[PDB]
Design a protein around this motif. Structure first.
Motif, short mmCIF file in Angstrom:
data_model
loop_
_atom_site.label_atom_id
_atom_site.label_comp_id
_atom_site.label_asym_id
_atom_site.label_seq_id
_atom_site.Cartn_x
_atom_site.Cartn_y
_atom_site.Cartn_z
N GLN A 1 -0.92 7.52 8.80
CA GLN A 1 -1.92 6.57 7.90
C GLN A 1 -1.02 5.50 7.10
OE1 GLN A 1 -5.43 6.77 8.68
NE2 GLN A 1 -4.46 7.62 10.20
N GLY A 2 0.49 5.42 7.24
CA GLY A 2 1.22 4.94 6.31
C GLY A 2 0.97 3.29 6.36
N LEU A 3 0.59 2.67 7.34
CA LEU A 3 0.37 1.28 7.25
C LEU A 3 -0.67 0.95 6.56
CD1 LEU A 3 0.95 0.03 10.98
CD2 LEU A 3 2.60 0.23 9.57
N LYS A 4 -1.71 1.87 6.25
CA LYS A 4 -2.85 1.33 5.44
C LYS A 4 -2.44 1.32 3.86
CE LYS A 4 -6.18 3.46 8.64
NZ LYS A 4 -7.09 2.13 8.88
N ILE A 5 -1.50 1.98 3.56
CA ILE A 5 -1.01 2.24 2.24
C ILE A 5 -0.02 0.78 2.18
CG2 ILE A 5 0.72 3.23 0.45
CD1 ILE A 5 -0.41 5.74 1.59
N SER A 6 0.97 0.62 3.24
CA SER A 6 1.72 -0.45 3.02
C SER A 6 1.22 -1.86 2.89
CB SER A 6 2.83 -0.36 4.15
OG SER A 6 3.72 0.71 4.26
N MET A 7 0.04 -2.04 3.85
CA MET A 7 -0.61 -3.23 3.89
C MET A 7 -1.24 -3.63 2.33
SD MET A 7 -3.60 -2.54 6.51
CE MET A 7 -4.55 -3.97 6.27
N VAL B 1 0.45 -9.77 6.31
CA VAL B 1 1.76 -9.63 6.92
C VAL B 1 2.66 -8.89 6.06
CG1 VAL B 1 3.70 -10.82 8.30
CG2 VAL B 1 1.39 -11.84 8.15
N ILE B 2 3.15 -7.78 6.79
CA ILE B 2 3.99 -7.05 5.96
C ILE B 2 5.35 -7.05 6.73
CG2 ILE B 2 2.30 -5.76 4.74
CD1 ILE B 2 3.09 -3.40 6.68
N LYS B 3 6.44 -6.62 6.03
CA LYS B 3 7.70 -6.23 6.67
C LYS B 3 7.60 -4.88 7.25
CE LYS B 3 10.32 -6.98 2.98
NZ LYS B 3 11.50 -7.20 2.20
N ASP B 4 8.09 -5.04 8.41
CA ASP B 4 8.08 -3.50 9.12
C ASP B 4 9.02 -2.62 8.33
OD1 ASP B 4 9.15 -1.40 11.00
OD2 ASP B 4 7.82 -2.23 12.12
N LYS B 5 8.75 -1.30 7.97
CA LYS B 5 9.58 -0.62 7.21
C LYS B 5 10.97 -0.18 7.85
CE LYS B 5 8.95 3.32 4.02
NZ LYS B 5 8.14 4.66 3.60
N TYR B 6 10.99 0.02 8.95
CA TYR B 6 12.24 0.28 9.79
C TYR B 6 12.35 -0.69 10.67
CZ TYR B 6 10.63 4.82 7.68
OH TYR B 6 10.06 5.62 6.63
N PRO B 7 12.79 -1.89 10.42
CA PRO B 7 12.83 -3.08 11.24
C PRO B 7 13.78 -2.62 12.60
CG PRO B 7 13.90 -3.44 9.21
CD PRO B 7 13.10 -2.28 8.88
N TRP C 1 8.16 -8.23 11.78
CA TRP C 1 6.96 -8.20 10.74
C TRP C 1 5.85 -7.45 11.48
CZ3 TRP C 1 9.36 -13.16 11.14
CH2 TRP C 1 10.25 -13.64 10.16
N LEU C 2 4.86 -6.99 10.66
CA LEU C 2 3.69 -6.36 11.37
C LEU C 2 2.59 -7.27 10.68
CD1 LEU C 2 4.18 -2.68 10.84
CD2 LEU C 2 4.75 -4.20 12.98
N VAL C 3 1.62 -8.04 11.66
CA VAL C 3 0.33 -8.56 11.20
C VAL C 3 -0.92 -7.51 11.38
CG1 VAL C 3 -0.96 -10.72 11.21
CG2 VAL C 3 1.34 -10.59 12.16
N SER D 1 1.82 4.67 17.37
CA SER D 1 1.89 5.89 16.73
C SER D 1 1.08 5.77 15.41
CB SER D 1 3.32 6.03 16.45
OG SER D 1 4.07 6.45 17.82
N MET D 2 1.22 4.44 14.85
CA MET D 2 0.49 4.20 13.42
C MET D 2 -0.81 3.85 13.72
SD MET D 2 3.04 5.34 11.66
CE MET D 2 2.56 4.64 9.98
N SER D 3 -1.75 4.37 12.86
CA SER D 3 -3.19 3.97 13.00
C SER D 3 -3.16 2.41 12.23
CB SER D 3 -4.08 4.68 12.20
OG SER D 3 -3.79 6.18 12.76
N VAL E 1 -4.75 -1.27 13.83
CA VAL E 1 -4.42 -2.49 14.60
C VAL E 1 -3.03 -3.23 14.09
CG1 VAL E 1 -6.18 -2.47 16.37
CG2 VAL E 1 -6.06 -4.11 14.35
N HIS E 2 -2.08 -3.47 14.70
CA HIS E 2 -1.04 -3.89 14.05
C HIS E 2 -0.39 -4.95 15.31
CE1 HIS E 2 0.25 -0.15 14.76
NE2 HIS E 2 1.61 -0.57 15.01
N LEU E 3 -0.03 -6.06 14.92
CA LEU E 3 0.74 -6.98 15.84
C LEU E 3 2.14 -7.10 15.38
CD1 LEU E 3 0.90 -9.37 18.22
CD2 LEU E 3 0.50 -10.83 16.17
#
Ligand SMILES: Nc1ncnc2c1ncn2[C@@H]1O[C@H](COP(=O)(O)O)[C@@H](O)[C@H]1O
Ligand SMILES: [K+]
Ligand code: NA
Ligand SMILES: [Zn+2]
Length: 180
Positions: free
Chosen positions: A9-15, A30-36, A42-44, A95-97, A99-101
């Motif tokens: 669920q990590g993306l839901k926090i980062s976003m 749009v966020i920076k990927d945490k482990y680019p 980036w992730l949209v 792997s991460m919940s 949707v993210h581009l």
DNA sequence: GAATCATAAC
């Protein structure tokens, strides 16, 4: 552990973290990927909660196209003068919940790219082109993925630029330098 | 020895 605190669920926090956000509008963040896995990664994500491409329908077509447009604008604003190539797309099995581009530069120059799985997830059919996903939703009304996706992650290392086969990640990282 | 293979995370 808890559902809300689970790694998936990590993306839901980062976003929602201002320090990770590089662009926001009324529909997407749009966020920076945490482990680019490259110099620019980036992730949209839409604000609205859609679990994965499995839950996408034609009502989401405009939103998917908007995510793509935003991805291209971020490239211009943050890396326009770069001589780098970019791809925009989705992992066939995420792997991460939520949707993210993925919006990722094609140097693949990053310490976080560590294994064959990382490489193949971006450099085989496991990486679904954003445009292809958009057109599948438009024509078929939903996203389907063929069998055999996990097997793609185990393919021998092959350069995306010149198709040369490399025996290892360190050697591959070395080889990639020549395409700068 | 270096690097990869698969497993585990309670
Ligand atoms: N907390 C996080 N914030 C931002 N990006 C993340 C986080 N955790 C994992 N990632 C990235 O999210 C992507 C998830 O992969 P996938 O689910 O296959 O699209 C990978 O590129 C990860 O590096
Ligand atoms: K091995
Ligand atoms: Na996974
Ligand atoms: Zn090459």
């Amino acid at each position: 552990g808890s559902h809300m605190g689970h790694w998936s669920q990590g993306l839901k926090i980062s976003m929602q973290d201002p320090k990770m956000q590089v662009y926001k509008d009324e529909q997407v963040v749009v966020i920076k990927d945490k482990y680019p896995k490259a110099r620019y990664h980036w992730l949209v994500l839409p604000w609205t909660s859609i679990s994965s491409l499995k839950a996408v329908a034609r009502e989401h077509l405009e939103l998917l196209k908007h995510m793509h447009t935003v991805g291209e604008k971020v490239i211009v604003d943050f890396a326009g003068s770069s001589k780098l190539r970019f791809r925009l797309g989705y992992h066939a099995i995420p792997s991460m919940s939520h949707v993210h581009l993925h919006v990722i530069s094609q140097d693949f120059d990053s310490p976080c790219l560590k294994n064959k799985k990382h490489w193949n997830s971006f450099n085989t059919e496991y990486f679904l082109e954003s445009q292809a996903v958009i057109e599948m939703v438009q024509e078929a009304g939903r996203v389907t993925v063929r069998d055999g996706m996990p097997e793609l992650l185990k393919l021998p290392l092959r350069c995306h630029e010149c198709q040369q086969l490399l025996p290892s990640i360190p050697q591959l990282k070395e080889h990639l330098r020549k395409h700068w």
